[PDB]
């Protein structure tokens, strides 16, 4: 899938990549269900290696994109 080979560039934000990334899932052949969790795991595995240990310390009860996009922004 489209979606699946986007990663953040060492001089690209967060949120440039985030917008990306979301676009490509939006425009992909995905359900609809599944790509909150498809964005999720992106932000998870595909982002910088300092944004990957910053996600990683968000509380379990963050669980939607908008919410981990607030959690590394707020942080920077």
Same mark, same amino acid.
């Given at each position: $899938?489209?979606?699946?080979?986007?990663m953040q $560039?060492?001089?690209e934000?967060?949120?440039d990549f985030a917008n990306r990334l979301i676009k490509a899932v939006? $425009?992909?052949?995905?359900?609809?269900?599944?790509?909150a969790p498809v964005i999720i795991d992106c932000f998870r595995q595909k982002?910088?290696?300092?944004?990957?240990?910053?996600?990683?310390?968000?509380?379990?009860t963050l669980t939607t994109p908008g919410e981990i996009i607030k959690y590394v922004?707020?942080?920077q």
């Open positions: $899938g489209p979606w699946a080979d986007i $560039g060492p001089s934000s967060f949120v939006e $425009g992909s052949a995905l359900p609809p269900s599944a790509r982002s910088q290696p300092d944004i990957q240990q910053l996600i990683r310390t968000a509380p379990s922004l707020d942080r």
